[PDB]
Amino acid sequence: MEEVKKDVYSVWALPDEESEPRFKKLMEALRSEFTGPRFVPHVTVAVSAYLTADEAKKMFESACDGLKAYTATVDRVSTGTFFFQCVFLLLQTTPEVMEAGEHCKNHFNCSYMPHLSLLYAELTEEEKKNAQEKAYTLDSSLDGLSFRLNRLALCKTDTEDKTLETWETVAVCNLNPGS
Numbered sequence: 001m002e003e004v005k006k007d008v009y010s011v012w013a014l015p016d017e018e019s020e021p022r023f024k025k026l027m028e029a030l031r032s033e034f035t036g037p038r039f040v041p042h043v044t045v046a047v048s049a050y051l052t053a054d055e056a057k058k059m060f061e062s063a064c065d066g067l068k069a070y071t072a073t074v075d076r077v078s079t080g081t082f083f084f085q086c087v088f089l090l091l092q093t094t095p096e097v098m099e100a101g102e103h104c105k106n107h108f109n110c111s112y113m114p115h116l117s118l119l120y121a122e123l124t125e126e127e128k129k130n131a132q133e134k135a136y137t138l139d140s141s142l143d144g145l146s147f148r149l150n151r152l153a154l155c156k157t158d159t160e161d162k163t164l165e166t167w168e169t170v171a172v173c174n175l176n177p178g179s
Contacts (some may be wrong), residue, residue, distance in 0.1 A: 008049070010048075010156070013149040016150045026139055037163060042117075045099075061173075074090075077135045086122075
């Protein structure tokens, strides 16, 4: 038996139950004033090559079995220059956060911009700044905010599909604690 279908998978770290509503509420409000597809908050940690279902499951089990729950800290809410990097919480480049996003082989020195996107949209420069301002107005204590990432999602996300209609989550797993 041979699997012949291959797709690109993305791996998402998900905020815990104490932090997820806070982000969803903000995502919902920004999305209403400005424009934008609805999605769940996450912090992406991996993008794969083309893999068969089996290969992706094995990659995902390894990811789950070996990544421990960790804590991310919000540096500031920032803006970018294309649809997927419109307004987002830029995370502090702490060790555990950075590690989750890296996939450098065991003994090498390779020498990843962790964030949790808030809004996806193609806005004018002014509208962008305004959306950034409104994020702080909707939730001012954002800068410095610490939150727990304790579950991963295995997904298929055609980054060129701005509607998100094709985005699908395939599988989920809880991360064991470590601290």
